[PDB]
Amino acid sequence: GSYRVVAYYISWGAYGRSYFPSDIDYSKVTHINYAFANIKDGEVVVGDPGVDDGGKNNFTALRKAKKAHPHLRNLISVGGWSWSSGFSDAAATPEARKRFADSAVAFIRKYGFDGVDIDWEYPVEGGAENMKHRPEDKQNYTLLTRSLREALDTAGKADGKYYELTTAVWGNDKFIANTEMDKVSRDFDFINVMSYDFNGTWNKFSGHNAPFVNDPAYDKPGIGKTFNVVSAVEAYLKAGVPADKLVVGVPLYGYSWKGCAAGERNGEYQDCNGKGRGTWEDGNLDFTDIEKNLLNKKGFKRYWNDTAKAAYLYNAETGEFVTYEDPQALKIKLDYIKSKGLGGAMYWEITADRKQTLVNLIADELLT
Ligand SMILES: CC(=O)N[C@@H]1[C@@H](O)[C@H](O[C@@H]2O[C@H](CO)[C@@H](O)[C@H](O)[C@H]2NC(C)=O)[C@@H](CO)O[C@H]1O
Ligand SMILES: CC(=O)N[C@@H]1[C@@H](O)[C@H](O)[C@@H](CO)O[C@H]1O
Numbered sequence: 001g002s003y004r005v006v007a008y009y010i011s012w013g014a015y016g017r018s019y020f021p022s023d024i025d026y027s028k029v030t031h032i033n034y035a036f037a038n039i040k041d042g043e044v045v046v047g048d049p050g051v052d053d054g055g056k057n058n059f060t061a062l063r064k065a066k067k068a069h070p071h072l073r074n075l076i077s078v079g080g081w082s083w084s085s086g087f088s089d090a091a092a093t094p095e096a097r098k099r100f101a102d103s104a105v106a107f108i109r110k111y112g113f114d115g116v117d118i119d120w121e122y123p124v125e126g127g128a129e130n131m132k133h134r135p136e137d138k139q140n141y142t143l144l145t146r147s148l149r150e151a152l153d154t155a156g157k158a159d160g161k162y163y164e165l166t167t168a169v170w171g172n173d174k175f176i177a178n179t180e181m182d183k184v185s186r187d188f189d190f191i192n193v194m195s196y197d198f199n200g201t202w203n204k205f206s207g208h209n210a211p212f213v214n215d216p217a218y219d220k221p222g223i224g225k226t227f228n229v230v231s232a233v234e235a236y237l238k239a240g241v242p243a244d245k246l247v248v249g250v251p252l253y254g255y256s257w258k259g260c261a262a263g264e265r266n267g268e269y270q271d272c273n274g275k276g277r278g279t280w281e282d283g284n285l286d287f288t289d290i291e292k293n294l295l296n297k298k299g300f301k302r303y304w305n306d307t308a309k310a311a312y313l314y315n316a317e318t319g320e321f322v323t324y325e326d327p328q329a330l331k332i333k334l335d336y337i338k339s340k341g342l343g344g345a346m347y348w349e350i351t352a353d354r355k356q357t358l359v360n361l362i363a364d365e366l367l368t
Contacts, residue, residue, distance in 0.1 A: 003337065003366035004247055004344030006031040006166075006192055007359075008077070010351060014051040014058055016280070019351040021061035026069040028356065028363035032062065033077045033117050033166075033192075035349065039086030042096050043103035044078050044116075053111060063112040073114040075166060076107060080119045081128055087120040088132045091140035100144065101151035108163060109155070115164030115189070116148060122170050124178035142180045149187040164189040168346075171195050171249070173226050173235040182240030191241050192346040196251040198227040199323065201275045201283040206257050206267055206321040210250065212309035212332055218269045228308070229333060233340065247343040248333060250362070252352035254285040254324030260314070266303050267314035267321040276320040279352075286352040290324050304328065327361055334365035 007029045013019040024032065038047045046052045053059050062074045079087060090100040104116045121127045123137035134140075145165070152163040165187060169175050171194050185191065199207030205220050211228045226235065229248065236246055259273025275283030285294070290313070294300045300313040300322065311326030337345060345362050353359050 001366070001368045004030045004190060004346075005362055005366055006033055006247055006344065006346035008033045008035050008347065008349040009058075010035050010349050011048050011051050011058055013351040014056040017351050019354075020056065021058055021065055024065065024350060025356060025359065026065055026072050028359050028367070030071070030073065030344070030367070032065075032072070032074045033346075034058070034062065034074060034113070035077045036080045036083055036119070037076050037078045037107060038083045039079065039090060039100075042086065042090050042099045044076070044100065044107045045103075047083070059111045066112065073164060074112070075115045075117040075164060076111070076113045077117040077119050077168070078104070079121065081121050082130075084119070084121045084127050085130045085132050087123075087144070088134050088137055088140070091144035092134065092136060094147075097144050097147035098151075101147040104148060105151050105155040109159070114161070115152065115166065117166045117168065117192075118145070118148070119168040121168075122175055122178065125174060126170065126172070138178050138180065142183045145184045145187045166190050166192060168192045168194050169236065171198055171227070171232045172224070173232070176235055176239045181236060185241045185245060188245065190245045190247050190343045191236070192247045193232055193236055193249050194348075195229040195232045195249045196348070199223070200255045201257060205269060205271050206260050207269060207323065208305070208308055208310040208312070209255055209323040210310070210325060210329070211305075212329060212336075213307070215305060215308040217265075217307065220269060230336070233336075233342070237340075243341040243343070245343050247346045248337055250330060250333060250345055250347045250358070251325050252287045252347050252349060252358055254287065254290055254322050256283050256285055256320055256322045259319040260321040261319070262314070262316060266301070266316070267319060268303070268305065268312055270321070272319065272321065276318075276322065285322060285324065286354075287324060287358055288352065288354040290322060291355060291357060294322060302326075325358060327357065330358055330361055331365070334362065337366065
């Protein structure tokens with residue numbers, strides 16, 4: 001088939017969530033991205049020895065899945081939001097790039113992965129409080145990608161297999177200004193656009209995690225008119241990412257605020273009073289939790305914004321507002337993938353939808 005389905009699996013699923021690689025329906029994906037490997041002393045390293053290469057042994061479980069499902073490709077995701085602070089150094093010199101690339105080859109060979117996903121958040125500007133940047137990141141992301149592609153090509157030749165190289169990219173078009181997407185696109189097998197986290201409880205006002213198109217009714221400070229899926233996809237296409245390599249990110253979680261004023265919009269784009277109820281932490285809901293507990297339940301009502309093409313919940317009693325991925329929005333995005341000839345769908349993350357409501361819709365629309 002023409003489309004990828006790239007599911008993130010979180011290593012920490014193997015703690016209180018009690019969701020292990022054995023729980024994944026491998027018929028519903030083409031790829032698993034394993035979140036995450038860390039960077040230590042310029043090398044890719046095991047993120048969590050309690051569940052990765054030992055203890056609950058998620059890596060053993062992913063190899064078991066590969067043997068049962070020969071179609072499957074498993075990629076190690078390096079870095080992410082919390083663990084990106086090592087990239088700028090790793091990318092900055094030819095010696096550091098070779099050390100990094102060689103450590104990535106060593107990792108996928110030892111643990112049985114089919115390639116490497118680079119989640120550098122983000123070159124030049126942006127990222128967590130611990131994040132490190134330098135202006136040279138714009139060219140060094142290209143050089144690190146080339147070093148990885150060369151190392152994985154050489155290793156694949158030695159091993160009689162093909163290793164993929166991918167990346168997660170910001171939904172914010174600053175990422176495009178701070179990288180050379182026309183160059184790196186040639187070396188990545190595909191590029192997962194994180195077309196989500198456009199709004200969240202970092203804002204004291206409500207908004208949509210993943211609105212499809214711009215809604216001019218949303219006018220809050222610093223919120224770009226490009227903070228939507230179509231704007232992000234069109235920006236990466238314009239920057240030179242080939243359509244067939246551009247994979248559209250979808251969230252399987254939601255965000256919540258409490259004490260949102262109703263205004264004229266049942267709590268949408270309103271000033272709120274902090275995080276709302278969550279599943280495993282305040283303000284963050286699994287789709288499973290929304291579906292079972294909140295979807296037209298417990299005083300929450302579902303609303304549809306036909307400008308943004310996004311659903312939300314509002315509880316008028318508590319003022320709680322939930323942004324989440326409704327099937328009505330996700331169907332529009334799956335049709336858009338097909339109409340644009342895109343590379344498929346990616347989602348964060350597979351444990352957050354236990355009934356596979358969104359998982360199954362994605363697989364039904366994109367897979368054979
Ligand atoms: C449109 C935009 O710039 N949104 C920012 C968010 O991207 C950012 O959230 C972070 O987004 C990453 C994906 O690009 C996630 O990997 C990361 O987990 C997420 N960070 C947090 C703390 O949720 C938020 C918050 O930093 O800021 C927005 O401005
Ligand atoms: C709980 C958690 O860590 N989730 C974040 C999430 O904000 C984001 O959607 C994703 C980007 O792929 O990165 C994850 O690490």
